[PDB]
Design a protein around this nucleic acid. Structure first.
Ligand code: K
Ligand code: K
Ligand code: K
Ligand code: K
Ligand code: K
Ligand code: K
Ligand code: K
Ligand code: K
Ligand code: K
Ligand code: K
Ligand code: K
Ligand code: K
Ligand code: K
Ligand code: K
Ligand code: K
Ligand code: K
Ligand code: K
Ligand code: K
Ligand code: K
Ligand code: K
Ligand code: MG
Ligand code: MG
Ligand code: MG
Ligand code: MG
Ligand code: MG
Ligand code: MG
Ligand code: MG
Ligand code: MG
Ligand code: MG
Ligand code: MG
Ligand code: MG
Ligand code: MG
Ligand code: MG
Ligand code: MG
Ligand code: MG
Ligand code: MG
Ligand code: MG
Ligand code: MG
Ligand code: MG
Ligand code: MG
Ligand code: MG
Ligand code: MG
Ligand code: MG
Ligand code: MG
Ligand code: MG
Ligand code: MG
Ligand code: MG
Ligand code: MG
Ligand code: MG
Ligand code: MG
Ligand code: MG
Ligand code: MG
Ligand code: MG
Ligand code: ZN
Lengths: 98, 129, 84, 149, 141
RNA sequence: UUUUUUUUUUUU
RNA sequence: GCGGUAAUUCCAGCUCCAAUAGCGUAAUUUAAGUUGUUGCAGUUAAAAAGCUCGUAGUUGGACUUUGGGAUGUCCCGUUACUUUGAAGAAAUUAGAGUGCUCAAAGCAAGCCUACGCUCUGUAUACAUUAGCAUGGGAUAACAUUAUAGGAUUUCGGUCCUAUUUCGGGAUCGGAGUAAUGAUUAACAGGGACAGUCGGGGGCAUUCGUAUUUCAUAGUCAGAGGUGAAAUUCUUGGAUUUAUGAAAGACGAACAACUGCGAAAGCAUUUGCCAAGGAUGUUUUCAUUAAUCAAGAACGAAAGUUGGGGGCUCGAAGACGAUCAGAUACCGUCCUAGUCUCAACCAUAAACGAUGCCGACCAGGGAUCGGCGGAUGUUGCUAGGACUCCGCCGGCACCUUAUGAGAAAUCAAAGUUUUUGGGUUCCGGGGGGAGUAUGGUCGCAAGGCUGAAACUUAAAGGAAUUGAC
RNA sequence: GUAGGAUAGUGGCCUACCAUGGUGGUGACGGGUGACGGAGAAUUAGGGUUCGAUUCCGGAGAGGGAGCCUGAGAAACGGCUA
């Protein structure tokens, strides 16, 4: 039985797509199929923001940000709970969670 | 490619009648198509049809009465003698009380009852009911 | 528009114009000819609306139109009148 | 659709329903034939002649004024080429592709396109032999194709 | 789709001829392999009893089905033939003459008896049915 | 994300 | 499926059931729309060649004389096909007649007893294809057309023949007659042209951090790796830090339910070489086309031969762990390989598990390319970017059933018992088996083609409930 | 194809000379048949599937080949010769 119209990937009008390496396990996975997330978070966690600001060596200074593009294979994504198993009707929803 | 303009026309009319459209477009036109339409109109399965000239094969616009259950082409055009008309009618028509099989004979394009009346055979073109 | 709300033999002119040139009831081109005159020369030349060649006025040796993907682009000085 | 591809484009010309010349046109049929013959002598193919006439002389359709096609006029005046224009262009394309392949042996795409072009050439040549536009002895040979043009 | 050309009768006939071989029954009846089988296309065959054997019944049944190893006189092929009815193996002896018939499934095993396609009809010219019902007596010699 | 093998035939 | 100590199923008694002077048991037809031309299937049940070209074969757009007056009749090259006729042994089959006592049969036979009669009857029909003859000229097949060497009237010169100057020929020219002789240009196809577009292809040529190694310099005790460790490297300075050099791979982020290509596949810049779809076109030819045995081009990864390279990773192999064992999963070091060139190999879940061409068939919003129109801005140079309305083509998506389906689902997997647009391939319960054998290709690995004996009642697809 | 021989007669049926022709994916050639062919038999919506040694018609054979006399007629076998 076929359970996904797209076949679990995002290839249309295309022969082959080069793979990426899972950021967790390193498994090869087609890029159009890998679960991709973009994390933009302060380098200093909110707990240490106050201490770092107090220890700042300049009159004013904006703390930088860390940008990370995580590309997970299906197994790693499910295990780490980046994605979860959804109902038959719910898995057709493509909009991101609020 | 386009092989049977008569088949294309009959399929267009059949689909349009199923959908309930009052008018249907046939392109390209042909004298065989016109004779088939005249045969249907004689028995009242279609309304008026108008031929549009475009310095090409032409076009036809046919009004649909709503009485046409199904019209179709028979391919290849098998040879039908005067004695095979009964078998062909049994194969193709829903009943012996109504329905027509169109044949092209040396006497012209006509329905199977007229072919039987004139004792003329030919080749089957299609059917309608 | 609903098929039953229109007549296939008497389509509205707006719909006929909007339709593709080959899909109209009777095929008709969207192109036309034009009488083009330069800015200074009284000579008048016939030019196709979709000219594929650089038409040049014989008198002053000036380009009237420039071929493009569709309609030819006339020079700024020159002007045109629809001929037909 | 396309003979040697999956393209389904329908772009083409839409001839007007009116077969008569426009009123504003004043040139005469013999003048049009003379111009066509002059262009042919200058070395313009029928398609080029038609394009030039439409774009410059305002002759939308040569048949409308003359009553006959450009190739027919050229043949009547003994100016038609030995081989038809389309076959000539196809042979030119094949020769160019072969010249490129002579130096690019890794261009398997060029090899594929050459195969397609020669198939088209052979089909067109067969049709022209059937219609007697080419002598029965005519044969397209890759080795000496450059000589024919 | 099917070929429908009015001039495609040859192609249709040849395609049907090629595809008929996919039919197991047609292939069985037209490959000419019936003559290499023990009966060689016959309903019955006479043979000599070589040995009494017991064949374990297939699951889920449990029993010892009684059969005889019979050598066919006309070609010397060795087969296994079931002996039906209760205690009918007692009427069979080594070097006896037995008539052998099919098991009813046209060369295939029947019931829980594995690899047996034949049965014994007569022994020493007397029907096993008659022997079972005591209508006749097995010849002494 | 340490490790976790196995369950006689028929029948209910 | 019955039989395991309460057997409607075995062995027996009784009773009952079917047929009946018949009944049981062991190639072939039907059922079988499970061989499908009528009339089957190929997304998941068995199934569409990895992709394209292409000869045989099959198939192939439109167009040429209609109408009235009247009354079968008057007026304005070769075939397929169809109608009719002749002929086409009996027997058999269908069928007319006939009380062999009926019947299967047979061709008998009936009145009245007349020194007889019914001329007694012993009909008729059927008969593929192929052949002969005849009426029709719709639908189709092949050939032909325009370099006039064309049709026709008359007349001049040349070449030969017969019935009683003449008739018949066979050529060469003059003159005239004529509406003088060419359908259109398919929302078929090919070709030309114009501005474009693309991560399509080949060659050459710039750039990038990172990895490893090396060189210089600084510091000292751990570094590495794991679930935890160990193998391993480390005061001859490991790991870490800065600068620089070399080598070979790889082209992140941008990057998408986006693009190009026949498929495989294709992502750094710039240059060159050819190639291509779509769009626009009042340009050209005029059926040149669709699909395809045989035959050909390309064809991931791995693999083969020989060079060049050999950073990284890494089959084989060797160790350290875990374990009852662990020839593994985890870790450490590594050969072939991974890259490129020349020559082979031709196979993948080579997938959309879904051939190609053509027609019709609901709605909607996005998006890529081109084009047409309108409109207002731009730290810009009529244009470009954005906004809005449309057309064509393309990758897709959402809703819906009036459709289909075993459903899952499908806007094509629809227009199918109301069955027929053209065309290629291919399946016939499950195994044996993609095996044996033969042939062919390959250096090899293996590829292509491809059985049978025998075995078996299921295997299998979709979906429901529970259990896990 | 030409000319002859032979035959009851036509014909590469055979002889001499001459020419290179003849068939074939519209399947030649080769192989299998537990293959004599037909009239017909079985089953019957229609289309079809299977069978046809056997009394009627045509062909061939007389254990396997070959040759031949007689005769209008035989390559005969309830004729002969090897
Ligand atoms: K799938
Ligand atoms: K995904
Ligand atoms: K194509
Ligand atoms: K175009
Ligand atoms: K058992
Ligand atoms: K049992
Ligand atoms: K049991
Ligand atoms: K007991
Ligand atoms: K008991
Ligand atoms: K029972
Ligand atoms: K290496
Ligand atoms: K263990
Ligand atoms: K290794
Ligand atoms: K290979
Ligand atoms: K797939
Ligand atoms: K669109
Ligand atoms: K003779
Ligand atoms: K001769
Ligand atoms: K025979
Ligand atoms: K005699
Ligand atoms: Mg599943
Ligand atoms: Mg792929
Ligand atoms: Mg094609
Ligand atoms: Mg199209
Ligand atoms: Mg165990
Ligand atoms: Mg009991
Ligand atoms: Mg009992
Ligand atoms: Mg089936
Ligand atoms: Mg499966
Ligand atoms: Mg399957
Ligand atoms: Mg496949
Ligand atoms: Mg092939
Ligand atoms: Mg036609
Ligand atoms: Mg056209
Ligand atoms: Mg460094
Ligand atoms: Mg980049
Ligand atoms: Mg892009
Ligand atoms: Mg090497
Ligand atoms: Mg390593
Ligand atoms: Mg390699
Ligand atoms: Mg394969
Ligand atoms: Mg756009
Ligand atoms: Mg099978
Ligand atoms: Mg002779
Ligand atoms: Mg025989
Ligand atoms: Mg017989
Ligand atoms: Mg007998
Ligand atoms: Mg006989
Ligand atoms: Mg004889
Ligand atoms: Mg004998
Ligand atoms: Mg003898
Ligand atoms: Mg004899
Ligand atoms: Mg005799
Ligand atoms: Zn992973």
């Amino acid at each position: 039985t076929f359970k996904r119209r797209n076949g679990g990937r995002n290839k249309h009008g295309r022969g082959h797509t080069k793979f990426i390496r899972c950021s967790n396990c390193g498994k090869c996975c087609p890029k159009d199929k890998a679960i991709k997330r973009f994390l933009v978070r302060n380098i200093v966690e909110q707990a240490a923001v106050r201490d770092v600001q107090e220890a700042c060596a300049f009159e004013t200074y904006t703390l930088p940000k860390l940008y990370l593009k995580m590309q997970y294979c299906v197994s790693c994504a499910i295990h780490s709970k980046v994605v979860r198993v959804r109902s038959v009707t719910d898995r057709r929803v493509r909009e991101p969670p609020q | 490619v386009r092989v049977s303009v008569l088949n294309d026309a009959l399929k267009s009319m059949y689909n349009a009648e199923k959908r309930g459209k009052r008018q249907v477009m046939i392109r390209p036109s042909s004298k065989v198509i016109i004779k088939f339409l005249i045969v249907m109109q004689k028995h009242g399965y279609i309304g008026e049809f108008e031929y549009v000239d475009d310095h090409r094969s032409g076009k036809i616009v046919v009004e649909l009465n709503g009485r046409l259950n199904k019209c179709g082409v028979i391919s290849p055009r098998f040879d039908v003698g005067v004695k095979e008309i009964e078998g062909w009618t049994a194969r193709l028509l829903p009943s012996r009380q109504f329905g027509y099989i169109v044949l092209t004979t040396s006497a012209g394009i006509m329905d199977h009852e007229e072919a039987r009346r004139k004792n003329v055979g030919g080749k089957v073109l299609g059917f309608f009911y | 528009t609903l098929p039953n709300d229109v007549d296939l033999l008497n389509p509205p002119a707006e719909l006929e114009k909007r339709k593709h040139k080959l899909k109209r009831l009777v095929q008709s081109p969207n192109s036309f000819f034009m009488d083009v005159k330069c800015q200074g020369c009284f000579n008048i030349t016939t030019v196709f609306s979709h000219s594929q060649t650089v038409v040049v006025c014989g008198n002053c040796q000036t380009v009237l139109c420039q071929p493009t993907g569709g309609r030819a682009r006339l020079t700024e000085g020159c002007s045109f009148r629809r001929k037909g | 659709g396309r003979m040697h591809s999956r393209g389904k484009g329908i772009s083409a010309s839409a001839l007007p329903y009116k077969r008569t010349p426009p009123s504003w046109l004043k040139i005469s049929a013999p003048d049009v034939e003379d111009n066509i013959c002059k262009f042919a002598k200058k070395g313009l193919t029928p398609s080029q002649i038609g394009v030039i006439l439409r774009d410059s002389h305002g002759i939308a359709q040569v048949k409308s004024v003359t009553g006959s096609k450009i190739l027919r006029i050229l043949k009547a005046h003994g100016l038609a080429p030995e081989i038809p224009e389309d076959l000539y262009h196809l042979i030119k394309k094949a020769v160019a592709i072969r010249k490129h392949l002579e130096r690019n042996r890794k261009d398997k795409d060029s090899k594929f396109r050459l195969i397609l072009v020669e198939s088209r050439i052979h089909r067109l040549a067969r049709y022209y032999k059937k219609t007697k536009k080419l002598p029965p002895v005519w044969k397209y040979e890759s080795t000496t194709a450059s000589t024919l043009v | 789709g099917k070929t429908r050309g009015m001039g495609a009768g040859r192609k249709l006939k040849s395609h049907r001829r090629r595809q008929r071989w996919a039919d197991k029954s047609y292939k069985k009846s037209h490959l000419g392999n019936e003559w290499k089988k023990p009966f060689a296309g016959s309903s019955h065959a006479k043979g000599i009893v070589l040995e009494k054997i017991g064949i374990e019944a297939k699951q889920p049944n449990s029993a010892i089905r009684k059969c005889a190893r019979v050598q066919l006189i006309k070609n010397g092929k060795k087969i296994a033939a079931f002996v039906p009815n209760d205690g009918c193996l007692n009427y069979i002896e080594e070097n006896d003459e037995v008539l052998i018939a099919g098991f009813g499934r046209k060369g295939h095993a029947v019931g829980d008896i594995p690899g047996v396609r034949f049965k014994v009809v007569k022994v020493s010219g007397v029907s096993l049915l008659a022997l079972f019902k005591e209508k006749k007596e097995k010849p002494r010699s």
